[PDB]
Design a protein around this ligand. Structure first.
Ligand SMILES: CCCCCCCCCCCCCCCCCC(=O)OC[C@H](CO[C@@H]1O[C@H](CO[C@H]2O[C@H](CO)[C@H](O)[C@H](O)[C@H]2O)[C@H](O)[C@H](O)[C@H]1O)OC(=O)CCCCCCCCCCCCCCCCC
Ligand SMILES: CCCCCCCCCCCCCCCCCC(=O)OC[C@H](CO[C@@H]1O[C@H](CO[C@H]2O[C@H](CO)[C@H](O)[C@H](O)[C@H]2O)[C@H](O)[C@H](O)[C@H]1O)OC(=O)CCCCCCCCCCCCCCCCC
Ligand SMILES: CCCCCCCCCCCCCCCCCC(=O)OC[C@H](CO[C@@H]1O[C@H](CO)[C@H](O)[C@H](O)[C@H]1O)OC(=O)CCCCCCCCCCCCCCCCC
Ligand SMILES: CCCCCCCCCCCCCCCCCC(=O)OC[C@H](CO[C@@H]1O[C@H](CO)[C@H](O)[C@H](O)[C@H]1O)OC(=O)CCCCCCCCCCCCCCCCC
Ligand SMILES: CCCCCCCCCCCCCCCCCC(=O)OC[C@H](CO[C@@H]1O[C@H](CO)[C@H](O)[C@H](O)[C@H]1O)OC(=O)CCCCCCCCCCCCCCCCC
Ligand SMILES: CCCCCCCCCCCCCCCC(=O)OC[C@H](CO[C@@H]1O[C@H](CS(=O)(=O)O)[C@@H](O)[C@H](O)[C@H]1O)OC(=O)CCCCCCCCCCCCCCC
Ligand SMILES: CCCCCCCCCCCCCCCC(=O)OC[C@H](CO[C@@H]1O[C@H](CS(=O)(=O)O)[C@@H](O)[C@H](O)[C@H]1O)OC(=O)CCCCCCCCCCCCCCC
Ligand SMILES: CC(C)CCC[C@@H](C)[C@H]1CC[C@H]2[C@@H]3CC=C4C[C@@H](OC(=O)CCC(=O)O)CC[C@]4(C)[C@H]3CC[C@]12C
Lengths: 390, 189, 75, 169, 85
């Protein structure tokens, strides 16, 4: 809660300035994000075979159609046809990956835990992701949602005092670190920053970060990815050459990583959402429901990605199945309507994420552009130097 | 403190059974051979206290063998052929001549190693001068003895050379080298 | 092909009769040895410049009398 | 680097095998060389060998991160096995992409990667490979001849096919 | 265990004498090592000769604090004392 209670007219003009479909109402402290799970009917937690098999076999068919189309004209295709096939395959794999992320939290087919764990491992493998490290990081996210200095497995924002500290530690903005930060948080490569998250899994490939009674499970978790990049990745190259690798593997990879990064970045970032450190005003239900955003999709994309944008219906109910995530949302707006936040697909939203909302300041408790912030903390350096000439 | 019940101020490091038999009682840690029947120290103790010679013999030969020296592997069943050649297929006279030659060679090797150790102590005393810059031309007898008894790993002497050349501190020495265990793989070796 | 295989402990290739005939005609065979209990098996070693480099082939020479002049002609 | 308050920071027990960053370094070097050479030539063997070696050595260097446990021992085992197989293939069969027309020049000698793999096997053996020492060939009736226990010896005889021989012992 | 310090002291004196070139009755049981014609890179050679004569290994810290032939003899006697155990 940052731009909390004031007339709804200015929050609506803010929502139109930012492309947001709504801005939340006031939320009082002392609540549990599991509370509002008592509202949903006792049939929203139901199990059925047809919906799940559709959710797994539809993006599969998308990917298969894209591959068949490509292998039909393997490398004689032009550039934008290649881009179309890459986007289609990456979207199908994002859907399959959401099925994976479902069976990782044990809420896909609880009837067969072994079969569902094997399915999650198999479907995470082609993206080079270990199932148990993913599960640990996602629970560690849920526990610290929107907490400062604590949720590093989400989109932890870069704050002001730390950037001034690095400014002094590098001796100006001309070092490698400052230039890297600028170039990564200013250009559309930010929309692919999830790649860096993939390099923060494999926690140094170090079992000293885990609980001993889990070692044999963590290593097997690092096995299915490695084995893949040890067996299949060669074969492809062997049978396709360098170009034949940049086509059938790397581009769908960048597509899936784009989808992942933008989903998360738009789900938990907004100027009307503050990032408090706990002790200095944090709360579970507040930073859960009030500091969140839900995005809108075309129903084709929603049946492809398998409800990949409904993150709150399963943050109030961690055991809510996947084919019921829209329906549950239907109930939630009926109850917490004024406090919800919503948004849609718009290149304007992404452009504001790229150019406007770049640095988080805790004084105004909101996001600011990076060049203005950098010139102004250079001005504060001028200030402290003026206090230092004598 | 992963230990639920008891956690002394020093962490528990597990102990495991040894993998090789100790040096006999008679040999020095160095390269020079031994007195070949009776050690020289046996002469400065009471007759009733030198049962440790024959006791150490009984131990290394029959009584405490570490169960890692009785592993049957594909490598040991060919080393058996080699050793049985040496012990049953050769006449003791040629064995004796080879023994004498080997003793002489090892004595010369030890003399060379001692000379090299002395030269090393000079060089390190010389380099600690550049290091600390000032007065200390000194070395440590500790490091000379540890070099003569092969108690340092190469990384240790490298770190020590750097530490001398940068800060002097000729009395700050690497911790120690720990004993190498006996390599095992599987039925292979 | 030689680009889609693993190097494995090079063995004696096999030629029937005419690949060897064409090879001795083109001047690339460098040496031949006779063996067999029936005096008709040949091990043929080619020379460097030949297509494929120096290698070893195995050939069974069906009894034809104009082979001798053929080999001795091409060195 | 250097730390003037304790220069001997590496020679301190951190909980992992000493030859641990060498395993990962060699896996990275192997995968990089595999990809580089197999794209710059067109042969399919070097990249397959390099990526397999890299993946197995990376898994080994992961399990070697807790040297007290049992995985910390099976890791060094796997690493030694892989580097030994590399040395073997190099010095006995050579590399496919290093074939030439002559027959004495295209013969297998020991090149750089084999030397590095051999240094790795030696460094593994000289550090600690003493784990899992209860796996060997089973004992004969020749090891239980003078054993002080009758049930054990009868068991061994029975297994090796001598259950009927009389134990006048 | 029970070691005869007399013999050990006699032989340490003999070894020091023979090593430096000074006559045996001049090296007193309390004569230090620099006053008897030896520097720093020569108190280590006589340490090596002592180990070679008695066939034992000198502890290193105790060898950093040797200044009188008496303490040398005492270190050697303590080494020979704890041999079987
Ligand atoms: C020239 C000098 C050789 C003279 C000689 O008598 O040359 C033949 C000698 C055999 O020498 C024998 O050497 C024997 C050595 O025996 C000694 O060693 C034996 C162990 O080999 C037994 O222990 C035996 O009891 C013990 O006395 C005895 O001296 C014999 O009398 C003597 O004939 O062989 C050799 O030099 C070894 C031949 C090596 C050829 C390869
Ligand atoms: C990282 C740079 C890649 C590189 O260097 O990597 C090159 C090799 C690693 O490449 C390996 O190369 C192997 C072939 O090596 C042979 O072939 C190479 C060229 O083909 C070199 O000649 C090398 O010395 C020689 O042994 C196989 O192709 C393996 O699959 C491939 O991983 O490393 C080396 O040179 C060995 C490195 C020694 C460092 C210790
Ligand atoms: C598909 C189906 C999806 C269903 C599942 C949805 C789950 C959504 C949750 C997923 C969580 C993903 C979080 C993403 C994430 O945190 O990334 C966002 C993180 C950033 O996030 C924060 O970043 C901080 C600054 O580094 C710290 O690292 C924090 O720890 C880190 O959390 O991404 C980064 O790490 C980017 C920095 C690395 C530099 C980028 C180099 C890019 C290389 C070039 C790319 C190739 C050229 C193009
Ligand atoms: C020469 C062979 C090198 C191996 C000698 C090791 C000897 C030793 O004790 O080392 C000294 C130390 C080992 O340190 C030893 O550790 C033991 C733990 O079991 C004990 O603590 C010993 O006391 C301690 O000395 O070596 C290192 O710390 C690692 C050195 C790496 C040496 C291998 C280099 C060759 C690798 C080439 C691969 C490059 C690929 C990229
Ligand atoms: C010179 C580089 C350091 C030497 C080295 O081998 O370090 C090897 C040392 C040895 O590593 C430590 O060795 C100790 C010796 O008992 C203990 O065994 C510790 O468990 C082990 O971690 O490890 C490091 O300090 C890692 C840095 C070396 C990384 C080099 C990358 C190539
Ligand atoms: C086919 C061979 C396949 C081998 C694959 C590669 C293996 C690599 C070499 C194994 C490491 C050496 C093990 C070791 O040193 O053991 C100790 C061995 C004796 O084995 C030991 O000998 C002991 C009896 S005794 O020493 O001979 O008295 C006995 O305790 C023990 O059972 C026996 O192992 O000591 C040796 O002298 C071995 C030196 C020769 C090894 C290098 C040659 C390389 C081959
Ligand atoms: C397809 C499969 C592909 C496989 C992919 C796998 C790729 C992995 C490649 C990894 C590259 C390995 C080299 C990394 C080096 C490193 O991280 O050093 C880690 C060390 C600390 O080690 C550490 O230090 C720790 C203690 S502390 O840091 O000193 O406090 C201690 O916990 C630990 O034991 C010790 O190791 O960092 C140092 O302090 C720097 C000095 C290191 C000496 C030179 C190395 C620098 C590079 C030179 C070139
Ligand atoms: C080459 C491609 C096509 C196949 C797949 C390769 C991956 C399995 C590799 C490539 C990048 C690697 C990562 C690159 C960097 C690191 C850090 C490195 O650990 C450290 O540096 C320790 C911490 C520190 O040094 O501070 C080893 C693990 C990790 C995550 C590596 C894990 C294995 C990764 C993901």
């Amino acid at each position: 809660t940052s731009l909390d209670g004031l007339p709804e007219t200015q929050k609506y003009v803010y929502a139109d300035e930012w492309g947001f479909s709504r801005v939340g109402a006031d939320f009082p402290p002392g609540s549990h994000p599991s509370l509002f799970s008592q509202l949903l009917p006792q049939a929203l937690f139901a199990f059925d075979a047809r919906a799940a098999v559709a959710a797994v076999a539809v993006p599969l068919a998308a990917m298969a159609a894209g591959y068949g189309w490509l292998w039909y004209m393997h490398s004689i295709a032009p550039v934008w046809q290649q881009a179309l096939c890459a986007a289609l395959i990456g979207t199908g794999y994002a859907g399959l990956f959401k099925v994976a992320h479902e069976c990782a939290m044990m809420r896909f087919i609880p009837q067969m835990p072994g079969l569902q764990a094997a399915l999650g491992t198999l479907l995470m493998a082609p993206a080079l992701y270990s199932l148990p490290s993913w599960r640990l990081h996602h629970l560690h996210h849920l526990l610290h949602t929107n907490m400062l200095w604590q949720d590093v497995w989400g989109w932890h924002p870069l704050t002001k005092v730390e950037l001034a500290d690095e400014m002094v530690r590098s001796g100006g903005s001309g070092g490698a670190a400052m230039a890297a930060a600028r170039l990564v948080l200013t250009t559309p490569i930010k929309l692919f920053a999830s790649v860096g998250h993939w390099l923060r899994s494999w926690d140094g490939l170090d079992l000293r970060h885990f609980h001993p009674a889990s070692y044999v499970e963590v290593l097997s978790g690092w096995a299915a990815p490695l084995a893949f990049a040890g067996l299949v990745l060669p074969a492809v190259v062997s049978a396709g050459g360098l170009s034949g690798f940049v086509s059938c593997y790397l581009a769908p990879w960048l597509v899936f990583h784009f989808w992942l990064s933008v989903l998360s970045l738009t789900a938990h970032t907004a100027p009307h959402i503050p990032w408090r450190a706990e002790g200095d005003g944090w709360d579970a239900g507040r930073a859960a429901v009030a500091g969140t955003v839900t995005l809108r999709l075309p129903r084709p994309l929603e049946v492809l990605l398998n409800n990949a944008n409904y993150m709150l219906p399963q943050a109030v109910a961690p055991g809510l199945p996947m084919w019921s995530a829209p329906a549950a949302y239907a109930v939630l707006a009926a109850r917490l309507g004024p406090y919800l936040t919503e948004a849609s697909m718009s290149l304007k939203l992404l452009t504001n994420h790229v150019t406007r909302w770049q640095i988080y300041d805790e004084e105004a408790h909101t996001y600011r552009p990076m060049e203005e912030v950098v010139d102004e903390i250079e001005a504060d350096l001028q200030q402290l130097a003026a206090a230092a000439q004598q | 403190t992963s230990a639920p019940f008891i956690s002394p101020m020093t962490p528990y490091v597990p102990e495991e059974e040894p993998t090789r038999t100790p040096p006999s009682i008679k040999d020095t840690g160095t390269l020079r051979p031994a007195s070949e029947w009776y050690p020289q120290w046996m002469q400065y103790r009471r007759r009733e206290d030198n049962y440790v010679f024959w006791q150490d013999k009984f131990m290394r030969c029959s009584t405490d063998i570490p169960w890692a020296e009785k592993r049957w592997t594909l490598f040991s069943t060919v080393w058996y052929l080699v050793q049985q050649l040496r012990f049953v297929g050769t006449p003791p006279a040629l064995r004796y001549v080879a023994f004498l030659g080997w003793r002489a060679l090892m004595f010369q090797v030890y003399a060379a190693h001692k000379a090299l150790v002395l030269w090393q102590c000079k060089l390190d005393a010389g380099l600690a001068r550049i290091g600390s810059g000032g007065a200390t031309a000194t070395f440590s007898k500790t490091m000379a003895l540890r070099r003569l008894h092969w108690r340092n790993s190469p990384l240790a002497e490298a770190l020590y050379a750097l530490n001398l050349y940068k800060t002097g501190r000729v009395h700050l020495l690497p911790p120690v080298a720990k004993p190498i265990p006996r390599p095992t793989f599987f039925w292979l070796f | 092909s030689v680009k889609t295989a693993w190097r494995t402990q090079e063995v004696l290739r096999e030629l029937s009769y005419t690949q060897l005939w064409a090879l001795v005609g083109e001047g690339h065979v460098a040496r031949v040895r006779f063996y067999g209990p029936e005096k008709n098996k040949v091990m043929a070693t080619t020379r460097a410049s030949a297509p494929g480099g120096e290698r070893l082939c195995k050939v069974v020479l069906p009894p034809d009398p104009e082979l001798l002049d053929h080999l001795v002609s091409n060195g | 680097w250097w730390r003037e308050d304790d220069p001997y920071w590496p020679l301190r027990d951190w909980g992992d095998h000493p030859m641990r960053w060498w395993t990962l370094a060699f896996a990275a070097i192997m995968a990089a060389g595999g990809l580089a050479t197999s794209v710059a030539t067109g042969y399919v063997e070097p990249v397959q060998a390099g990526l397999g070696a890299g993946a197995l050595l990376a898994l080994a260097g992961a399990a070697m991160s807790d040297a007290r446990c049992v995985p910390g021992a099976l890791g060094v085992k796997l690493a030694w096995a892989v580097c030994a197989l590399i040395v073997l293939k190099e010095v006995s069969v050579g590399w496919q992409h290093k074939r030439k027309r002559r027959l004495a020049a295209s013969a297998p000698r020991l090149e750089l990667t084999g030397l590095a793999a051999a240094a790795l096997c030696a460094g593994y053996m000289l550090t600690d490979m003493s784990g899992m020492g209860e796996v060997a060939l089973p004992p004969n009736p020749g090891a239980v001849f003078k054993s002080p226990d009758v049930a054990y010896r009868a068991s061994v005889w029975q297994k090796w096919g001598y259950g009927q021989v009389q134990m006048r012992v | 265990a029970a070691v005869d310090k007399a013999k050990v002291l006699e032989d340490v004196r003999s070894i020091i004498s023979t090593q430096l070139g000074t006559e045996l009755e001049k090296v007193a049981p309390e004569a230090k090592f620099v006053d008897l014609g030896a520097d720093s890179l020569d108190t280590v050679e006589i340490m090596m000769a002592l180990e070679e004569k008695f066939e034992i290994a000198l502890e290193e810290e105790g060898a950093e604090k040797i200044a009188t032939v008496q303490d040398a003899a005492d270190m050697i006697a303590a080494q020979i004392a704890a041999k079987g155990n």
